[PDB]
């Protein structure tokens, strides 16, 4: 009976990232303290009108998970997950500023189940030396993003947050 269904308000104080809420979520704000484990499906596509998929967690079938700690994989994700309510499908339009460290993380996330383990850090140094002097990885995502950086769009579907440890 009433056309109006929303009211403007403030959120997403940090600049360089646009926020939209694709779907609602049940429950209050999740307990976000250091040590808590977070399980959250993610998908990263291009900001362009094509919106081609770069990384999808759904085809793999393994929802990526983290802990609330100083992994410093990407600060903006560490903020967005904290600034989220459980069971909330959401869309985030970041900018070229934050998405500088992305390509290496994308390579690691594509190769974590491909046959490479994160328990080693010398292989990454060897890869950096190869990139600097010897050769190039040649991966499509690396060429598309490292050579030309663009803003990205991230779909986040968090599953749950566990008690610490």
């Amino acid at each position: 009976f009433q056309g109006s269904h929303m009211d403007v308000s403030l959120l997403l104080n940090v600049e360089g990232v646009k926020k939209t809420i694709l779907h609602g979520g049940t429950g209050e704000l999740p307990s976000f303290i250091t040590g808590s484990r977070v399980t959250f499906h993610f998908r990263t596509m291009k900001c362009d009108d094509e919106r081609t998929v770069i990384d999808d967690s759904k085809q793999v079938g393994q929802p990526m998970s983290i802990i609330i700690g100083n992994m410093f994989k990407l600060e903006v994700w560490e903020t967005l997950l904290t600034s989220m309510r459980l069971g909330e499908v959401a869309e985030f339009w970041c900018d070229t500023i934050h998405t500088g460290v992305y390509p290496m993380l994308s390579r690691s996330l594509r190769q974590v189940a491909e046959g490479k383990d994160p328990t080693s850090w010398h292989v990454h140094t060897c890869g950096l030396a190869n990139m600097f002097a010897y050769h190039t990885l040649g991966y499509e995502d690396l060429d598309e993003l490292q050579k030309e950086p663009q803003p990205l769009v991230f779909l986040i579907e968090l599953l749950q947050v566990e008690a610490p440890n």
Binding site: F1, Q2, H5, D7, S9, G24, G25, T26, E28, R85
Partner: peptide, 17 residues
Amino acid sequence: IMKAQALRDNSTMGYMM
């Protein structure tokens, strides 16, 4: 007022409590 809207999402209510 907005807890009494005829067409409202109960989950959405929790976002701006």
